[PDB]
Design an enzyme around this catalytic site. Sequence first.
Site, PDB file in Angstrom:
ATOM      1  N   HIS A   1       0.808  -1.216   0.000  1.00 48.59           N
ATOM      2  CA  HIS A   1       0.000   0.000   0.000  1.00 48.59           C
ATOM      3  C   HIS A   1       0.845   1.272   0.000  1.00 48.59           C
ATOM      4  O   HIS A   1       0.264   2.351  -0.071  1.00 48.59           O
ATOM      5  CB  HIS A   1      -1.026   0.004   1.155  1.00 48.59           C
ATOM      6  CG  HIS A   1      -0.460   0.081   2.551  1.00 48.59           C
ATOM      7  ND1 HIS A   1       0.263   1.158   3.017  1.00 48.59           N
ATOM      8  CD2 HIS A   1      -0.549  -0.784   3.592  1.00 48.59           C
ATOM      9  CE1 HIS A   1       0.594   0.957   4.284  1.00 48.59           C
ATOM     10  NE2 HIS A   1       0.105  -0.213   4.660  1.00 48.59           N
TER      11      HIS A   1
ATOM     12  N   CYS B   1       4.282   1.361   9.528  1.00 45.63           N
ATOM     13  CA  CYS B   1       4.062   0.290   8.566  1.00 45.63           C
ATOM     14  C   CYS B   1       5.388  -0.198   7.998  1.00 45.63           C
ATOM     15  O   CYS B   1       6.320   0.585   7.792  1.00 45.63           O
ATOM     16  CB  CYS B   1       3.148   0.775   7.442  1.00 45.63           C
ATOM     17  SG  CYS B   1       1.453   0.977   7.984  1.00 45.63           S
TER      18      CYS B   1
ATOM     19  N   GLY C   1       3.470   5.929  10.380  1.00 44.57           N
ATOM     20  CA  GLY C   1       4.808   5.708   9.885  1.00 44.57           C
ATOM     21  C   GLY C   1       5.411   4.374  10.263  1.00 44.57           C
ATOM     22  O   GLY C   1       6.527   4.074   9.830  1.00 44.57           O
TER      23      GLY C   1
HETATM   24  C1  LIG Z   1       1.262   2.633   8.678  1.00 40.26           C
HETATM   25  N1  LIG Z   1       2.240   3.459   8.670  1.00 40.26           N
HETATM   26  C2  LIG Z   1      -0.154   3.046   9.104  1.00 40.26           C
HETATM   27  N2  LIG Z   1      -1.224   2.375   8.390  1.00 40.26           N
HETATM   28  C3  LIG Z   1      -1.598   2.571   7.142  1.00 40.26           C
HETATM   29  O1  LIG Z   1      -1.044   3.358   6.358  1.00 40.26           O
HETATM   30  C4  LIG Z   1      -2.786   1.699   6.803  1.00 40.26           C
HETATM   31  C5  LIG Z   1      -2.943   1.537   5.334  1.00 40.26           C
HETATM   32  C6  LIG Z   1      -4.204   2.194   4.882  1.00 40.26           C
HETATM   33  C7  LIG Z   1      -4.743   2.979   6.082  1.00 40.26           C
HETATM   34  N3  LIG Z   1      -4.053   2.311   7.205  1.00 40.26           N
HETATM   35  C8  LIG Z   1      -4.550   2.203   8.452  1.00 40.26           C
HETATM   36  O2  LIG Z   1      -3.894   1.600   9.310  1.00 40.26           O
HETATM   37  C9  LIG Z   1      -5.892   2.833   8.826  1.00 40.26           C
HETATM   38  N4  LIG Z   1      -6.700   1.704   9.279  1.00 40.26           N
HETATM   39  C10 LIG Z   1      -7.604   1.087   8.505  1.00 40.26           C
HETATM   40  O3  LIG Z   1      -7.868   1.379   7.350  1.00 40.26           O
HETATM   41  C11 LIG Z   1      -8.345  -0.092   9.145  1.00 40.26           C
HETATM   42  F1  LIG Z   1      -9.040   0.260  10.221  1.00 40.26           F
HETATM   43  F2  LIG Z   1      -7.479  -1.018   9.526  1.00 40.26           F
HETATM   44  F3  LIG Z   1      -9.190  -0.674   8.303  1.00 40.26           F
HETATM   45  C12 LIG Z   1      -5.807   4.038   9.814  1.00 40.26           C
HETATM   46  C13 LIG Z   1      -4.918   5.139   9.206  1.00 40.26           C
HETATM   47  C14 LIG Z   1      -7.198   4.640  10.058  1.00 40.26           C
HETATM   48  C15 LIG Z   1      -5.169   3.676  11.172  1.00 40.26           C
HETATM   49  C16 LIG Z   1      -4.103   0.671   4.870  1.00 40.26           C
HETATM   50  C17 LIG Z   1      -3.678  -0.310   3.803  1.00 40.26           C
HETATM   51  C18 LIG Z   1      -5.313   0.143   5.632  1.00 40.26           C
HETATM   52  C19 LIG Z   1      -0.378   2.920  10.608  1.00 40.26           C
HETATM   53  C20 LIG Z   1       0.133   1.778  11.199  1.00 40.26           C
HETATM   54  N5  LIG Z   1       0.015   1.533  12.503  1.00 40.26           N
HETATM   55  C21 LIG Z   1      -0.596   2.397  13.254  1.00 40.26           C
HETATM   56  C22 LIG Z   1      -1.177   3.600  12.800  1.00 40.26           C
HETATM   57  C23 LIG Z   1      -1.834   4.482  13.692  1.00 40.26           C
HETATM   58  C24 LIG Z   1      -2.393   5.635  13.214  1.00 40.26           C
HETATM   59  C25 LIG Z   1      -2.311   5.953  11.843  1.00 40.26           C
HETATM   60  C26 LIG Z   1      -1.675   5.110  10.981  1.00 40.26           C
HETATM   61  F4  LIG Z   1      -1.641   5.491   9.658  1.00 40.26           F
HETATM   62  C27 LIG Z   1      -1.075   3.885  11.414  1.00 40.26           C
END
Ligand SMILES: *C(=N)[C@@H](NC(=O)[C@@H]1[C@@H]2[C@H](CN1C(=O)[C@@H](NC(=O)C(F)(F)F)C(C)(C)C)C2(C)C)c1cncc2cccc(F)c12
EC number: 3.4.19.12
Lengths: 306, 306
Positions: free
Chosen positions: A41, A145, A143
Amino acid sequence: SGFRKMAFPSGKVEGCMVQVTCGTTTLNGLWLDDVVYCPRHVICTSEDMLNPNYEDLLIRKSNHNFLVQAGNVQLRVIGHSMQNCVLKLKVDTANPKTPKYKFVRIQPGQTFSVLACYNGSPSGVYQCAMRPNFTIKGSFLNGSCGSVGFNIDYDCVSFCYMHHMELPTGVHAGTDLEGNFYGPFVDRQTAQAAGTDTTITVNVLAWLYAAVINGDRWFLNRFTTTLNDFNLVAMKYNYEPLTQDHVDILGPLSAQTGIAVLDMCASLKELLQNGMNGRTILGSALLEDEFTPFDVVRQCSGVTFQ
Amino acid sequence: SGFRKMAFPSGKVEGCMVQVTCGTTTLNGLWLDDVVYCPRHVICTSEDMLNPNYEDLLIRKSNHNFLVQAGNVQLRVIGHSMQNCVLKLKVDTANPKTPKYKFVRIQPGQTFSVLACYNGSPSGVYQCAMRPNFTIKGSFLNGSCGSVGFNIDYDCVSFCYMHHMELPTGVHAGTDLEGNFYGPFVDRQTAQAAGTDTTITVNVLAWLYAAVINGDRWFLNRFTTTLNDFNLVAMKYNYEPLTQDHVDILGPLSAQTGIAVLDMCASLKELLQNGMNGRTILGSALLEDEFTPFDVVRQCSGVTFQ
Ligand SMILES: *C(=N)[C@@H](NC(=O)[C@@H]1[C@@H]2[C@H](CN1C(=O)[C@@H](NC(=O)C(F)(F)F)C(C)(C)C)C2(C)C)c1cncc2cccc(F)c12
Ligand SMILES: *C(=N)[C@@H](NC(=O)[C@@H]1[C@@H]2[C@H](CN1C(=O)[C@@H](NC(=O)C(F)(F)F)C(C)(C)C)C2(C)C)c1cncc2cccc(F)c12
């Protein structure tokens, strides 16, 4: 003695973390030999992230669209491909710090160490379990991921997890290093949610044995039980079933303490029915289920890794 | 989000661990530049360990009585001296993996990472706090002496602990890297015992702020309290006093959550008086006191180290 949530030494993995940038998105990659692995992604825009066709998105990308930072040194990307939910970025330099390694997939109930990273820079290390519902209760911010989970077998790093997303309840989902998700999660923004979890019974029993080894004995009793009658109580309290294989796996801990497995099951039944009545076990007022029998033997006997 | 007992990445310290043997005793040493630091009790026999005169014991030793193993490579010892309760072994090779480092001494209530080691080989990493009574609740087996505790400031390793002994209650005592013990403990076999401990109040408040940041809010209330009236309750429950400096240190967390420090104190008072009534905070049914305000900001904001 003592008992801590203990991770593997992280040095061998620190030497493999790099920064991967595509467009305005920056995340972490894993650099092994001449390949950099990262979540696919990375190639998505904010509006791509809604409902993406990754084959389409990737064919529109070029090698030069991927900036890879190995500390303060450019890595030149000379090829790219998709393998399930991860990207493989071929680079023109093999990582001289590549440890011996394996890509393994773990089972719910198993544990591993996580090296949390940001901008390709390791920030901390901690121990997690793969939950029965295929989430992990991690600690991850924007960040993070591309951070990886792993175990160390002696001198060999078995990579088992790469971080992809945070679910709405604050738990975490990701893939093995072949890019195959743990659990029913997808790398696209749906309303997906963790779904029901259970307590890892064999791990709770292992941790009760750790407590006995460290001198906590108040929960012991002369009682015993049958496996069938124990599992009747386990199901009622959202614990998962105990198999004969679990009993066999607990054999060494049983012999070391002199407490038969089914006796420790009787102790667990009473703790589930009565609670702890103000007392604690290994510094916890809850039954802890994120230590495996192996973790207990490792820490209450003392194996190293070189 | 999420909140874990998180250690610093251990790679920089792994590169400094060696094995030190004298007579039949083997333990760990710390190799920085051309010096190897280890507990001085390495030179004691079992019957020396009863009541030892270390100046006498050391003058009877020779450079060749010290075998130092750096992985699978001999280090030749070319000098030895005693500094308080540690030995300094001069060797004929400077450690090429020496990180930038400092020797610092920490305060009770502060945290650090421990790299548990055996035979010079790192086995695991975990996070501890220095207790108010100058013990640490570690996880250490035979052979772990000489393992070190440390923090990482950005790229610089601040070594703060070297492990020397286990007390009868299963907690641990050791020195700073100048060889000065934390607390009233000595490297000789007396009936010494930990003595009374207290709960680290400012850390409990920091961890309550971490919980709010991660969505646990059930313990909040409209109530407030004065610092003086809070400290009256703290003393009754074996908590240590909260100072105005602690309140100032909690300022950023208060601003981030919008919950005034004295309001969070009011929440803590109620938790102490009422308990938790079956509920949990950040996966614990106890009030956790081994995260500092800095640890909370680090993990609920996201600083790395390079
Ligand atoms: C990684 N750096 C980050 N996560 C993402 O970039 C990840 C990718 C798109 C959005 N996302 C993600 O985690 C969403 N969650 C969802 O879409 C879910 F609920 F899982 F369906 C959020 C940004 C709303 C958290 C993909 C492919 C889903 C990441 C990683 N770890 C923790 C994080 C906390 C807060 C924000 C982030 F972007 C986070
Ligand atoms: C380190 N490898 C080991 N500790 C020692 O060697 C240490 C040195 C003499 C004995 N000892 C020690 O820890 C004693 N404890 C005491 O004497 C005490 F109660 F503290 F007063 C025990 C062997 C009985 C544990 C010195 C100078 C006191 C060590 C380190 N960490 C954990 C250990 C667990 C079990 C056995 C060990 F030897 C341990």
